[PDB]
Each structure stands twice: as C-alpha cells, then as structure tokens.
Design a protein around this ligand. Structure first.
Ligand SMILES: CNC(=O)c1ncccn1
Length: 121
C-alpha cells in the first residue's frame, strides 16, 4: 500500500522530531539523575512505591522502535519521570529539586513541540 508508506514516512518524521525533543529535555538534566532506570539493586523496594518506572534511556528505546504514536504518548512518559521522582523523593532532596527544575525547563520545549507538531501535522 502506498498510503501505508506515506504513513510510515510521517511516523518516521514524528520520530525525527521527537528525538530532537528528547535530546533537548535530557540536556536539562546535566546531572543525569533521570538517564537510566532507578536501580532495583540500589533501591530494592522501588517497585513497591512506583508502579510505572520511567527514564530517559527507556524513552529512547521506545522512540527508536517508533513506539510513540503522537506527542501526547511521549509527554506522558516525560511526566512519569517527573511525577515518579516527586513522589518517591521528599521535597528537600536533590532528586526532588532536579525534577522540579526539569519540569519547569522542559515546559518551554514541550510548548514549542506541541505547536510545531500541530503545524506540520
Ligand atoms: C530519579 N532517581 C531517583 O529517584 C533515585 N532515588 C534514590 C536513589 C537513586 N535514584
């Protein structure tokens, strides 16, 4: 089908845009607090607290598998990273504060990407 090629051309390009977004969001985490899954060896009880772990590396694997259908799905993973962190860690920790900063700073990027995805369909 010629239509499913053109579809795959869009999905491919959504992936292209989202990858740039991912890189921008991640740049706002220079301490690499959110780069890899929370270690279940280092935090054995983590899954008793957080039912849906998320991290930048895991987002990237999905991204490269063209597993994101739209910006919303991508944004919901980004929010997971932040919301998980602000639940698991108390307010006055370096982790919680890094989440707040990433949330605020990533907000600009996500406001851009929403408009640009709407524009170019
Ligand atoms: C987002 N990272 C965390 O929440 C974390 N919490 C405790 C130890 C290591 N990492």
């Amino acid at each position: 089908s010629m239509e499913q090629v053109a579809m795959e051309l869009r999905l491919t390009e959504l992936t292209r845009l989202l990858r740039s977004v991912l890189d921008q969001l991640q740049d706002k985490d220079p301490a690499r607090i959110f780069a890899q899954p929370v270690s279940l060896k280092e935090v054995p009880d983590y899954l008793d607290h957080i039912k849906h772990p998320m991290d930048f590396a895991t987002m990237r694997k999905r991204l490269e598998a063209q597993g994101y259908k739209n910006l919303h799905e991508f944004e919901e993973d980004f929010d997971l990273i932040i919301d998980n962190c602000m639940k698991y860690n108390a307010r006055d920790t370096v982790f919680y504060r890094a989440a707040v900063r990433l949330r605020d700073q990533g907000g600009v990027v996500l406001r851009q990407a929403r408009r640009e995805v709407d524009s170019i369909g």
